[PDB]
């Protein structure tokens, strides 16, 4: 007698948005914006190092905290907030650029630069770098005059990179607490450090003066760095206040660095990270962290954007 055409419906309708309507009910919808966070660092498949109290830049110079990571190798690199690049108070020049380089280095390979010295002390040590007793950066040499107040001989040291990769060279300038202390270490008169390459040229002067005490010290050691091209040479000319490198650094390969405050997990597999954990999602967007890194869904301001996966829901006439 009669045949009717129809479509299914529910009493359990879910609202979505369109070009025209706001809150139009459809039969079924799904979320496009990921909000589910895994408060761990899913490190399965990736060789991972947790620097802990070692700052990433410290792996190059070598304070006590970084003694394990002097030649580390990794696919994933994690920096911790408690980390520190420094024992004797100081900071890197162009620090962030260098960090970014080391974050994707794959780790570092160290190699002796082979500097040799004559009428000069090299055993410069401090209480801030305790290792059994007083000590200093593992990869560096704190050069002094010889006895006390004695003149520091003008020196010239050079290093050639005989490898097919750029060499990371680092050196420090020491700022004594006073011109008195500077003289006691390197002798009277003005002091100059010039660093020349075929692509780099800079000059440095020490700056004795009272600073606030950090780690019980008012002195500052500031670090400088350059990348040395293959077959290129660096030459160091100096007469005091110079922190010499003992080894150069070579990047191992490819990696990725993050800054996290949550534990590492080796069972879960991930590819998108932020400071609070791992984002694992096939969803196109996320509202967790705008600074998330790796292979991630795009960050959006919205916490939810429902995509209709069903027709417009129309309740049945009772």
């Amino acid at each position: 007698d009669k045949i009717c055409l129809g479509h299914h419906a529910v009493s359990n309708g879910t609202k979505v948005n369109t070009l025209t309507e706001r809150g139009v009910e459809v039969v079924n919808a799904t979320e496009t914006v990921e909000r589910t966070n895994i408060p761990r660092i899913c490190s399965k498949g990736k060789r991972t190092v947790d620097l802990g109290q070692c700052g990433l830049l410290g792996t190059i110079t070598g304070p006590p905290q970084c003694d394990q990571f002097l030649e580390f190798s990794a696919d994933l690199i994690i920096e911790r907030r408690e980390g520190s690049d420094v024992c004797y108070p100081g900071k890197f020049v162009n620090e962030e650029a260098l960090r970014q380089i080391l974050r994707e280095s794959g780790g570092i390979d160290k190699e002796a630069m082979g500097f040799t010295y004559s009428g000069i002390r090299t055993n410069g040590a401090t209480s801030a770098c305790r290792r059994s007793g007083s000590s200093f950066y593992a990869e560096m040499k704190w050069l002094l005059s010889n006895t006390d107040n004695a003149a520091f001989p003008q020196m010239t040291k050079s290093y050639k990179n005989t490898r097919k990769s750029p060499a990371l060279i680092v050196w420090g300038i020491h700022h004594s607490v006073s011109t008195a202390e500077q003289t006691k270490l390197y002798g009277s008169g003005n002091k100059l450090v010039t660093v020349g390459s075929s692509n780099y040229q800079q000059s440095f002067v020490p700056s004795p003066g009272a600073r606030p005490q950090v780690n019980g010290l008012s002195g500052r050691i500031d670090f400088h760095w350059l990348m040395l091209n293959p077959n290129d040479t660096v030459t160091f000319s100096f007469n005091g206040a110079f922190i010499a490198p003992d080894r150069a650094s070579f990047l191992r390969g490819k990696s990725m660095g993050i800054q996290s405050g949550v534990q590492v997990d080796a069972n879960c597999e991930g590819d998108c990270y932020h400071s609070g954990g791992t984002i694992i999602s096939n969803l196109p967007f996320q509202n967790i962290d705008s600074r998330a890194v790796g292979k991630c869904p795009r960050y959006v301001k919205q916490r939810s954007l429902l995509l209709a996966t069903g027709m417009k829901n129309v309740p049945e006439i009772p």
């Binding site: 970014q100 705008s290 795009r298």
Partner: protein, 169 residues
């Protein structure tokens, strides 16, 4: 105690498909789902879903620092840039979803219409539209005849005499 079609409600009992048939005759009332229309609709929606799962091969790394804050000028430039692209993606996301949902709803309405139009062309001159999305069949259509319509084996030639007779006085 009548039955009604899509033009004035959905069917909360149609639980084995998106689109379907509801008939009534001497044998009583019945409801079955249509495969071809339902599958088409499902194929298109899942098609959208796959199109949004396709991950990006672009890897992004840190350009700032939340432990040691970068220099102010370059920091504000970075934040200004990030928030700008965040605005863009937030816009894109909002519009994409709104655009797709508008399409999902419409293409579903299309499928419903195409199904209705198909049945109409099957019944030829043997039925009339009742206005609710149903067809008054002007001959006797048992369960067998009703099934014949659903699987497109209905031959209007068989019932045309009986039908045209009843439609006119």
């Amino acid at each position: 105690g009548a039955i009604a079609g899509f033009i004035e409600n959905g069917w909360e009992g149609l639980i084995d498909g998106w689109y379907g048939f509801r008939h009534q005759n001497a044998q009583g009332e019945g409801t079955a789902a249509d495969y071809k229309s339902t599958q088409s609709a499902i194929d298109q929606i899942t098609g959208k879903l796959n199109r949004l799962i396709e991950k990006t091969n672009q890897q992004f790394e840190l350009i700032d620092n939340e432990f040691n804050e970068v220099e102010k000028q370059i920091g504000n430039v970075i934040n200004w840039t990030r928030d700008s692209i965040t605005e863009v993606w937030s816009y894109n996301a909002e519009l994409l979803v709104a655009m797709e949902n508008q399409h999902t709803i419409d293409l579903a309405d299309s499928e419903m219409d195409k199904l209705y139009e198909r049945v109409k062309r099957q019944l030829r001159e043997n039925a009339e539209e009742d206005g609710t999305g149903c067809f008054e069949i002007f001959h006797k259509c048992d369960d067998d005849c009703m099934a014949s319509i659903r699987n497109n084996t209905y031959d209007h030639s068989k019932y045309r005499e009986e039908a045209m007779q009843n439609r006119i006085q």
